[PDB]
Design an enzyme around this catalytic site. Structure first.
Site, PDB file in Angstrom:
ATOM      1  CD  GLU A   1      -0.833   0.315   3.786  1.00 30.74           C
ATOM      2  OE1 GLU A   1      -1.622   1.244   3.839  1.00 30.74           O
ATOM      3  OE2 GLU A   1      -0.486  -0.313   4.792  1.00 30.74           O
TER       4      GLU A   1
ATOM      5  CG  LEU B   1       1.204   4.799   4.009  1.00 32.60           C
ATOM      6  CD1 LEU B   1       1.533   3.334   3.828  1.00 32.60           C
ATOM      7  CD2 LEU B   1       0.928   5.240   5.396  1.00 32.60           C
TER       8      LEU B   1
ATOM      9  CG  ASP C   1      16.548   0.916  10.563  1.00 31.01           C
ATOM     10  OD1 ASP C   1      17.231   1.691  11.221  1.00 31.01           O
ATOM     11  OD2 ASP C   1      16.545   1.061   9.341  1.00 31.01           O
TER      12      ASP C   1
HETATM   13  N1  4SP Z   1      10.184  11.116   1.502  1.00 30.11           N
HETATM   14  S1  4SP Z   1       8.655  11.411   1.217  1.00 30.11           S
HETATM   15  O1  4SP Z   1       8.107  12.020   2.420  1.00 30.11           O
HETATM   16  O2  4SP Z   1       8.637  12.241   0.018  1.00 30.11           O
HETATM   17  C1  4SP Z   1       7.840   9.888   0.992  1.00 30.11           C
HETATM   18  C2  4SP Z   1       8.206   8.714   1.749  1.00 30.11           C
HETATM   19  C3  4SP Z   1       7.468   7.565   1.585  1.00 30.11           C
HETATM   20  C4  4SP Z   1       6.403   7.420   0.693  1.00 30.11           C
HETATM   21  N2  4SP Z   1       5.602   6.321   0.478  1.00 30.11           N
HETATM   22  C5  4SP Z   1       5.982   5.094   0.722  1.00 30.11           C
HETATM   23  N3  4SP Z   1       7.384   4.806   0.926  1.00 30.11           N
HETATM   24  C6  4SP Z   1       7.711   3.565   1.212  1.00 30.11           C
HETATM   25  O3  4SP Z   1       8.970   3.163   1.323  1.00 30.11           O
HETATM   26  C7  4SP Z   1       9.781   4.378   1.059  1.00 30.11           C
HETATM   27  C8  4SP Z   1      11.160   4.192   1.759  1.00 30.11           C
HETATM   28  C9  4SP Z   1      12.193   5.272   1.380  1.00 30.11           C
HETATM   29  C10 4SP Z   1      13.562   5.036   2.114  1.00 30.11           C
HETATM   30  C11 4SP Z   1      13.509   4.924   3.634  1.00 30.11           C
HETATM   31  C12 4SP Z   1      12.459   3.760   3.990  1.00 30.11           C
HETATM   32  C13 4SP Z   1      11.121   4.008   3.302  1.00 30.11           C
HETATM   33  C14 4SP Z   1       6.735   2.542   1.407  1.00 30.11           C
HETATM   34  N4  4SP Z   1       6.745   1.140   1.656  1.00 30.11           N
HETATM   35  C15 4SP Z   1       5.489   0.782   1.673  1.00 30.11           C
HETATM   36  N5  4SP Z   1       4.670   1.798   1.415  1.00 30.11           N
HETATM   37  C16 4SP Z   1       5.451   2.832   1.236  1.00 30.11           C
HETATM   38  N6  4SP Z   1       5.136   4.168   0.942  1.00 30.11           N
HETATM   39  C17 4SP Z   1       6.081   8.600  -0.013  1.00 30.11           C
HETATM   40  C18 4SP Z   1       6.763   9.789   0.146  1.00 30.11           C
END
Ligand code: 4SP
Lengths: 297, 258
Positions: free
Chosen positions: A82, A84, A128
């Site tokens: 999903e 976020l 983590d």
């Molecule tokens: N930086 S940000 O604020 O622009 C933003 C951040 C995360 C997301 N969305 C999102 N990201 C994930 O892993 C992203 C990941 C990046 C590296 C660190 C661990 C997490 C997910 N894994 C399941 N669902 C996930 N959704 C959208 C925008």
């Protein structure tokens, strides 16, 4: 295989692999795709992926990122999750002026503690937790993400990987080399994150293991046998450590009320045995008026 | 740290039922037999000792092998390939420092190639639907150990040895769940060494009694009594080491008096 997904944009790079935002062309669902480069003549499916997948399939909870599917190729492995909207780190930075209102801090903490209590109940250590791995949506939810450092634990625990948890959020039993660590390492991390939501800055921003220890000691006091039976025999405990006095918590996170400080102190207890469990935290008086405010994204 | 000990025990009790292999699968296997499975299992014990692998790793490998063979027909010349991939997955899941793929190719004295090992890894993952966090006899024993008074290192090592023996013989141990085998092994070990019995506190925890443990226990007692004569002997050899208090050379009781 990936014919129904349209990549929209790269999102970031976590413990292993690469995460993209994508949309499902038939349903409209926006997803996050974690792409895993695999190969033959190397080590095959990486351990991080094996643990993440097997554990996430087990962990279905509203405050845990949902693994939707695994498209396992001879070339690439793709985890479909999903999507976020953003991470807590980016949210705190955007609330730079305003600050995060206490109701939102309380809801987010309450939710993370439910997420964590669910993991611990299912013999999973996250290891983590930090604001880049805590993800928020436009409905007031926050969820645990990036289970690439996670593992299944046993009762009682045996020794697991020492090289764990980002430094600023790393528990003292890990910094001091204890042969056993458990669930209380995730609580220490969330305790630092509780502090950071309030002050909008890292509680213990050390740049080395000894810097990290000394910053914790200057805040919580240098622990001795009275506060923490056994500390002085711990492997990386040094009798030359300076002996700082403990600070009053009103000074540690000044805007926090008495219940808040009482919860924070329990989540930052030195002795991992006395440190509060996520399950028990949910019943702390700090949460008596908790609601779920929808955040101003 | 007990705040979750009963949640965890509950959850493992649920998952052992979902991760249980099919009890009569060997009769649906044209080319392999219970005896070829024993040889494989006995070789995995050796590989674990060679690489100083956790006991938990070996128990998980076996679980992977039995679940895979419950749905996949395999020719005898390929069974060790299945076993090598399973040990690879288990080590990756459970070990801090797992052996590299090349160590696994070598251990089969080049019967197979890296590419076959890695392709089989992928097929085991597909057949098990990446569902690798399975409960094992070991995970149950370790919780039961907490109920001793006082803790006795010999009872622990002997219980571990017995549970390990059970991995070797599919007939009869596939019909029993990990929690039940662990019950039988703990009772048998506790009895052999101290004269004592399945404690009342584990009746309250598990719901298991000596009566419900009986069938597994008579099977395990016989296995214990016949161990010095079994065609497979690597577990007996491993448990002669000081790390396991030399328990494999304690004498089994002649009777259990149940
Ligand atoms: N930086 S940000 O604020 O622009 C933003 C951040 C995360 C997301 N969305 C999102 N990201 C994930 O892993 C992203 C990941 C990046 C590296 C660190 C661990 C997490 C997910 N894994 C399941 N669902 C996930 N959704 C959208 C925008």
């Amino acid at each position: 295989s990936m014919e129904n997904f349209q990549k929209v944009e790269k999102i970031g790079e976590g413990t292993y692999g690469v995460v993209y935002k994508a949309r499902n062309k038939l349903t409209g669902e926006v997803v996050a795709l974690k792409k895993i480069r695999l190969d033959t003549e190397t080590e095959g499916v990486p351990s991080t992926a094996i643990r993440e997948i097997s554990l996430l399939k087990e962990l279905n909870h509203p405050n845990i990122v949902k693994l939707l599917d695994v498209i396992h190729t001879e070339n690439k492995l793709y985890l479909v999750f999903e999507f976020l909207h953003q991470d807590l780190k980016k949210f705190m930075d955007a609330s730079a002026l305003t600050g995060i209102p206490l109701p939102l801090i309380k809801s987010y903490l309450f939710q993370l503690l439910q997420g964590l209590a669910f993991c611990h109940s299912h013999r999973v250590l996250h290891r983590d937790l930090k604001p880049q791995n805590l993800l928020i949506n436009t409905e007031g939810a926050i969820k645990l993400a990036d289970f690439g450092l996670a593992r299944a634990f046993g009762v009682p625990v045996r020794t697991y990987t020492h090289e764990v948890v980002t430094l600023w959020y790393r528990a003292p039993e890990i910094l001091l080399g204890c042969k056993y660590y458990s669930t209380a390492v995730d609580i220490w991390s969330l305790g630092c994150i509780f502090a950071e939501m309030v002050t909008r800055r890292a509680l213990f921003p050390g740049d080395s293991e000894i810097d990290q220890l000394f910053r914790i000691f200057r805040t919580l006091g240098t622990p001795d046998e009275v506060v923490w039976p056994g500390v002085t025999s711990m492997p990386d405990y040094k009798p030359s450590f300076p002996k700082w006095a403990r600070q009053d918590f009103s000074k540690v996170v000044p805007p926090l009320d008495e219940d808040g400080r009482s919860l924070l102190s329990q989540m930052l207890h030195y002795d991992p045995n006395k440190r509060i469990s996520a399950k028990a935290a949910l019943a702390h008086p700090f949460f008596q008026d908790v609601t779920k405010p929808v955040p101003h994204l | 740290v007990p705040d979750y000990h009963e949640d965890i025990h509950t959850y493992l009790r649920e998952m052992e039922v979902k991760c249980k292999p099919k009890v009569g699968y060997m009769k649906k296997q044209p080319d392999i037999t219970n005896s070829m499975r024993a040889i494989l299992v006995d070789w995995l014990v050796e590989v674990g000792e060679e690489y100083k692998l956790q006991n938990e790793t070996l128990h998980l490998a076996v679980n992977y092998i039995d679940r895979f063979l419950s749905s996949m027909s395999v020719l005898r010349g390929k069974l060790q390939l299945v076993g090598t991939a399973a040990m690879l997955l288990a080590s990756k899941f459970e070990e801090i420092y797992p052996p590299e793929v090349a160590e696994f190719v070598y251990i089969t004295d080049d019967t197979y190639t890296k590419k076959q090992v890695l392709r089989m890894e992928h097929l085991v993952l597909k057949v098990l639907t990446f569902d690798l966090a399975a409960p094992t006899v070991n995970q149950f024993l370790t919780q039961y150990f907490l109920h001793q008074q006082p803790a006795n290192c010999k009872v622990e090592s002997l219980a571990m040895f017995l549970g390990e023996l059970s991995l070797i013989d599919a007939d009869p141990y596939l019909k029993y769940l990990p929690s039940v085998i662990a019950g039988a092994a703990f009772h048998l070990a506790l009895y052999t060494v101290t004269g004592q019995s399945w404690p009342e506190s584990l009746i309250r925890k598990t719901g298991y009694t000596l009566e419900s443990l009986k069938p597994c226990l008579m099977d395990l007692h016989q296995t214990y009594l016949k161990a010095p004569q079994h065609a497979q002997q690597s577990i007996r050899e491993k448990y002669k080491n000081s790390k396991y208090h030399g328990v494999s050379l304690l004498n089994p009781p002649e009777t259990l008096n149940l």
